[PDB]
Ligand binder design. Structure first.
Ligand SMILES: *[C@@H]1O[C@H](CO)[C@@H](O[C@@H]2O[C@H](CO)[C@@H](O)[C@H](O)[C@H]2NC(C)=O)[C@H](O)[C@H]1NC(C)=O
Ligand SMILES: *[C@@H]1O[C@H](CO)[C@@H](O)[C@H](O)[C@H]1NC(C)=O
Ligand SMILES: *[C@@H]1O[C@H](CO)[C@@H](O)[C@H](O)[C@H]1NC(C)=O
Ligand SMILES: *[C@@H]1O[C@H](CO)[C@@H](O)[C@H](O)[C@H]1NC(C)=O
Ligand SMILES: *[C@@H]1O[C@H](CO)[C@@H](O)[C@H](O)[C@H]1NC(C)=O
Ligand SMILES: *[C@@H]1O[C@H](CO)[C@@H](O)[C@H](O)[C@H]1NC(C)=O
Ligand SMILES: *[C@@H]1O[C@H](CO)[C@@H](O)[C@H](O)[C@H]1NC(C)=O
Ligand SMILES: *[C@@H]1O[C@H](CO)[C@@H](O)[C@H](O)[C@H]1NC(C)=O
Ligand SMILES: *[C@@H]1O[C@H](CO)[C@@H](O)[C@H](O)[C@H]1NC(C)=O
Ligand SMILES: *[C@@H]1O[C@H](CO)[C@@H](O)[C@H](O)[C@H]1NC(C)=O
Ligand SMILES: *[C@@H]1O[C@H](CO)[C@@H](O)[C@H](O)[C@H]1NC(C)=O
Lengths: 361, 49, 124, 264, 49
């Protein structure tokens, strides 16, 4: 039936025909993550008493802690939430190298300029993101706290700059810029202006001019052993079994065994010959391992003409007869359905490696 | 597959599938031309024999 | 094969590839034809004699010493001294690990050696 | 507490041919019998490395720091005990101190107000003459990073004319992660760098996020009048270059070749 | 480059690269086939000589 399906006909002719491949299915899963560590202070980051200005954005580093972004996303205490390199639904199980948190306050109109690859007042002269960004931007309206009727004009920002700044390049200089041929002399002068200006933030102000507390959560991957993860579910290190595995976010499938490879105390993630990922060292325990994808191959159906009979033979090429689940093994592979004989005849159906089949009484 | 959501993953996967398709097609064409050359050589060898 | 090289055995990638048409059948047909052509080439080049001949044990060939090219009896195979010298004169798993299989030739080396020995015996 | 030393021999710097040394592991992954090609910051083959003297003879100059630095010191009893990094070194930029105690190394990314010639003070008066910790600098007001780790003694004793100890360090600054690689070798030579090849084992890539452009070593040192073992250090400057490396089945980098050298 | 912003000029450049690569590949394949024909002719001429 497989041959009829693949040949798109109800009649077949004597010979050998290739058919769909076979591959051993996985059985279990391994999700061994790093060891127990304290909880990340994301609350400390967002619940901070004071927020700095855009030109003096804070730089916080998060590493070596347990993070739980489910609470972060599920909370309704965030006005907008945009992830540019990942998805919040499957963000929890990922493992990270390091996280960077940057917090400030932005006018409501210009928050859209924080997206990568944009041009604007707050995207050219004070703060910038690269287009190869992976972090997530979270903004929240905070007119009830920040906005003050007396004037909270300590929020200052760059009106203009001599040249656009490279991504993640903070600038604190307050040198008077010159916008004319005359040299800029003194604090003030013709075409000499202070490059910093204070917004207008009052509780009476409406949307667009309302201040918004904005935080950026960038993060780096594929640089070092993982530091931040989520749920652990340390299961086991079963061996010689076709299983799924996830060691530090490196999802894969195959069989595992103890290897004799000489790893230096800073070595892991083997790359023996090709680009494929070789043996790896698991977390929570220092023992070298190995990875080998499950047994696979391509079956072949060996049949006489359907005008003659309906009994066929099956050749699993490239796989030993022991691990396949009238068996007879040849150099080509495991041939089943036919009985080997000591006699020698001419080749009717070319099997290979000096072996040929036929249909005889 | 494990980083992105379904609807946005296909956009990335399409680039890889097109690139690998082009690579495989080029390899197949090169093999066909080399096989033709070897066919000519084998015919000449049979005649010489 | 295509679905394994192109796609890492995932449902999404396979279902995306399913909409590009029957490219895989074309590539597989071309490669299978190439392999069959190689087998036909080998058979046409060597299978030139109807019956396998046998050189006599007597080596009285008018003083022409033929010991170098005649099949070697004191060897695991029947390859001659020149044949074994040429064989001696002239990483694999990684390619197979991504679905690139190397099929074995239909005629093994011993059969080719027998054909060659029969040809020399008939000629001499 | 710091006394500007003047017992120095006015010696111009020397030039030496940095033949082949200075190859480090660029990736944490493992390979075996692979001729992998890479492009990164390295020490160019067959370059002019600057040779100083540190023992009368007292060379303590400040050197520029750009694109990392390759510090290769051959010494007896390890007079050199630390390094300083930064831009102003006058409590105006975040300064890095890697002074190495006989007990353990201490890494201080703090605001330091150094002296004009912050030579390492007399060692046998710290807590001996009712004194205390450092003071090559005046005060340490704000600390941003503090760390302590295993020291680097490597034969901190002896006085011999063919001392085997030779310690190499390479310092790199990328993405605010101060990368340090190092290796020790027991070579029975006197002055010249050996006609040999060796790898470099990473120690720690601790984060800094600071601007570094200046560099000066610290060597243990009455200010005028001292008895110190023989020592000599070489400073080389790295460049962005492409190499082709060759590992072995043991995993060690057994060979490497340049890609921008002579056409062969 | 001079008509669009750099963050959104990658699409047009990518399309141009794909087109030029396709043209170059077609030219190379045609050259290979015609070279095979010329090789057959050269072998025939060598035999005749
Ligand atoms: C034919 O040639 C063979 C090959 O040289 C001769 O056999 C050699 O005889 C010498 C005599 O000591 C030996 O040292 C070699 O080892 C022999 N070679 C082999 C391959 O056995 C042989 O004598 C020659 N004449 C005849 C009649 O066979
Ligand atoms: C802020 O603090 C309150 C009270 O401790 C807590 O309920 C809330 O979850 C915190 N939220 C953040 C974002 O820190
Ligand atoms: C964590 O570390 C402890 C102490 O080294 C060890 O016993 C344990 O197996 C590790 N892994 C865990 C608790 O999952
Ligand atoms: C059926 O048809 C095939 C045609 O290939 C022929 O070889 C075979 O002998 C036929 N068998 C019978 C029983 O007619
Ligand atoms: C297949 O199994 C047999 C049975 O022991 C063994 O001798 C042979 O080496 C196996 N083949 C391979 C390629 O491992
Ligand atoms: C015929 O082949 C079978 C299986 O290869 C073998 O066991 C048997 O001994 C053979 N018969 C003779 C007479 O050698
Ligand atoms: C080192 O400098 C000297 C003189 O400054 C010069 O002759 C020599 O070529 C330089 N070495 C190299 C490798 O360029
Ligand atoms: C480390 O060295 C400094 C400099 O001499 C010294 O003041 C300090 O006491 C040393 N640390 C210890 C633990 O002895
Ligand atoms: C230390 O930090 C405080 C508060 O940020 C600042 O007022 C002081 O000038 C700083 N001193 C130095 C030496 O950096
Ligand atoms: C470090 O500070 C100096 C001070 O002149 C400056 O020239 C240099 O550009 C700074 N480096 C970086 C990476 O900001
Ligand atoms: C290197 O590997 C070879 C073979 O794998 C082994 O014989 C030798 O002892 C190993 N040497 C070291 C230093 O690991």
């Amino acid at each position: 039936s497989e041959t009829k399906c693949t040949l798109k006909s109800f009649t077949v002719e004597k010979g050998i025909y290739q058919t769909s491949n076979f591959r051993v299915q996985p059985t279990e899963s391994i999700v061994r993550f790093p060891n127990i560590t304290n909880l990340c202070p994301f609350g400390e980051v967002f619940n901070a008493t004071r927020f700095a200005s855009v030109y003096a954005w804070n730089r916080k580093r998060i590493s070596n802690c347990v993070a739980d972004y489910s609470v972060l996303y599920n909370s309704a205490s965030f006005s907008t939430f945009k992830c540019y390199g990942v998805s919040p639904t499957k963000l929890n199980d990922l493992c990270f190298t390091n996280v960077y948190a940057d917090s400030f306050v932005i006018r409501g109109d210009e928050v859209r300029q924080i997206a990568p690859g944009q041009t604007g007042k707050i995207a050219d002269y004070n703060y910038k993101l690269p287009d190869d960004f992976t972090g997530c931007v979270i903004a929240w309206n905070s007119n009830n706290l920040d906005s003050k009727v007396g004037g909270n004009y300590n929020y200052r920002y760059r009106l203009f700059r001599k040249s656009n700044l490279k991504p993640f390049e903070r600038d604190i200089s307050t040198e008077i810029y010159q916008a004319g041929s005359k040299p800029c002399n003194g604090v003030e002068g013709f075409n000499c202006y202070f490059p910093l200006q204070s917004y207008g933030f009052q509780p009476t102000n409406g949307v667009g001019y309302q201040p918004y507390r904005v935080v950026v959560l960038s993060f780096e991957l594929l640089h070092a052993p993982a530091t931040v993860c989520g749920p652990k579910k340390s299961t086991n290190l079963v061996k010689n079994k076709c299983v799924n595995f996830n060691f530090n976010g490196l999802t894969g499938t195959g069989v595992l065994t103890e290897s004799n490879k000489k790893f230096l105390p800073f070595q892991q993630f083997g790359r023996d010959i090709a680009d494929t990922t070789d043996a790896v060292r698991d977390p929570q325990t220092l023992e070298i391992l190995d990875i080998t994808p499950c047994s696979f191959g391509g079956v072949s159906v060996i049949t006489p003409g359907t005008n003659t009979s309906n009994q066929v033979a099956v050749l699993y090429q490239g796989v030993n007869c022991t691990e396949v689940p009238n068996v007879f093994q040849t150099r080509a592979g495991c041939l089943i359905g036919a009985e080997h004989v000591n006699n020698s005849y001419e080749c009717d159906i070319p099997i290979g490696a000096g072996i040929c089949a036929s249909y005889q009484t | 597959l494990s980083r992105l959501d379904p609807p946005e993953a296909e956009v990335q996967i399409d680039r890889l599938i097109t690139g690998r398709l082009q690579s495989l097609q080029t390899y197949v064409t090169q093999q066909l031309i080399r096989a033709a050359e070897i066919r000519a050589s084998a015919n000449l060898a049979a005649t010489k024999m | 094969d295509c679905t394994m090289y192109i796609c890492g055995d995932s449902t999404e990638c396979s279902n995306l590839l399913l909409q590009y048409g029957s490219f895989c059948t074309q590539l597989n047909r071309a490669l299978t034809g190439i392999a069959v052509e190689q087998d036909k080439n080998t058979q046409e080049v060597f299978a030139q004699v109807k019956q396998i001949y046998k050189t006599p044990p007597i080596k009285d060939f008018g003083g022409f010493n033929f010991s170098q090219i005649l099949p070697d009896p004191s060897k695991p195979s029947k390859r001659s001294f020149i044949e074994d010298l040429l064989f001696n004169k002239v990483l694999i798993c990684a390619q197979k690990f991504n679905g690139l299989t190397v099929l074995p030739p239909l005629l093994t080396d011993e059969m080719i050696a027998q054909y060659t020995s029969a040809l020399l015996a008939g000629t001499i | 507490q710091c006394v500007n030393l003047r017992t120095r021999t006015q010696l111009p710097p020397a030039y030496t041919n940095s033949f082949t040394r200075g190859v480090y592991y660029p990736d944490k992954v493992f390979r075996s019998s692979v001729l992998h090609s890479t492009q990164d910051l390295f020490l160019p083959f067959f370059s002019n490395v600057t040779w100083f003297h540190a023992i009368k003879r007292f060379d303590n100059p400040v050197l520029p720091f750009n694109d990392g630095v390759y510090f290769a010191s051959t010494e007896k009893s390890n007079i050199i005990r630390g390094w300083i990094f930064g831009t102003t070194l006058d409590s105006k930029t975040q300064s890095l101190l890697i002074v190495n105690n006989a007990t353990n190394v201490v890494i201080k990314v703090c605001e330091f107000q150094f002296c004009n010639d912050p030579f390492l003070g007399v060692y046998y008066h710290k807590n001996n003459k009712s004194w205390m910790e450092s003071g090559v600098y005046s005060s340490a007001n704000n600390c941003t990073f503090e760390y302590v780790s295993q020291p680097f003694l490597m034969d901190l004793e002896g006085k011999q004319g063919n001392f085997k100890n030779l310690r190499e360090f390479v310092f790199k600054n990328i993405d605010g992660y101060f990368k340090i690689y190092s290796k020790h070798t027991p070579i029975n030579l006197v002055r010249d760098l050996p006609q040999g090849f060796s790898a470099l084992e990473p120690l720690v890539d601790l984060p800094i996020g600071i601007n570094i452009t200046r560099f000066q070593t610290l060597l243990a040192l009455s200010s005028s009048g001292w008895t110190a073992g023989a020592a000599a250090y070489y400073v080389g400057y790295l460049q962005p270059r492409t190499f082709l490396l060759k590992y072995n089945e043991n995993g060690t980098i057994t060979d490497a070749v340049d890609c921008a050298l002579d056409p062969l």
